[PDB]
């Protein structure tokens, strides 16, 4: 077993954790440290700040790492563009197309 965080890649750990769904549908192998970051929904915040793909939540402007398998399960792609975080995606965007036309 090898931690699938590319900045880590360790084969030694006290506890093997599970991460994001890989292209196979299997869950990634992460070491204790990296898997703890993932479980707290702060993996990309701790390891991916130099990468492209960050967007701000449509409602609260929280930074969300898009185009990244490690945040795929915590990011919602919104109907009219943009992204919503775990909190703000319980709601839908009201754009000017909702106007009493119905």
Q: Of 34, 37, 75, 83, which one interacts with Zn ion (CB under 5 A)?
A: 34
Indicate which of Zn ion, a copy of itself, none lies near residue 49 (CB less than 5 to 8 Å, by partner kind).
none
- Residue 4 makes contact with Zn ion by CB under 5 A: no
Contact 65, 54 (CB under 8 A): yes
Residue 27: count other Cβ atoms within 10 Å of its Cβ. Answer: 13
Contact 92, 79 (CB under 8 A): yes
- Residue 64 makes contact with Zn ion by CB under 5 A: no
Q: For 86-89, which contacts have Cβ atoms below 8 Å and span 24 or more sequence positions?
A: 86/41, 87/60, 88/57, 88/58, 88/59, 88/60, 88/62
Show contacts with a copy of itself in window 81-100 (CB under 8 A): 81-83, 89, 92, 95-97, 99
Size of the site for Zn ion (CB under 5 A): 16
- Residue 90 makes contact with Zn ion by CB under 5 A: no
**Contact residues for a copy of itself, defined by CB under 8 A:** 2-4, 6, 9, 22-23, 28, 48, 51-56, 64, 66-70, 72, 75-83, 89, 92, 95-97, 99, 101
């Amino acid at each position: 077993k090898m931690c699938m965080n590319a900045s880590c890649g360790t084969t030694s750990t006290v506890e093997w954790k599970k991460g994001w769904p890989l292209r196979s549908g299997l869950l990634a192998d992460l070491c204790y440290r990296c898997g703890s970051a993932y479980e707290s929904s702060l993996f990309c915040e701790q390891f991916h700040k130099d990468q492209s793909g960050w967007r701000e939540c449509y409602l609260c402007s929280k930074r969300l790492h898009c185009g990244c398998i490690a945040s795929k399960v915590t990011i919602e792609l919104m109907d009219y563009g943009g992204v919503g975080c775990s909190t703000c995606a319980c709601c839908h965007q009201l754009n000017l197309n909702t106007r009493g036309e119905n």
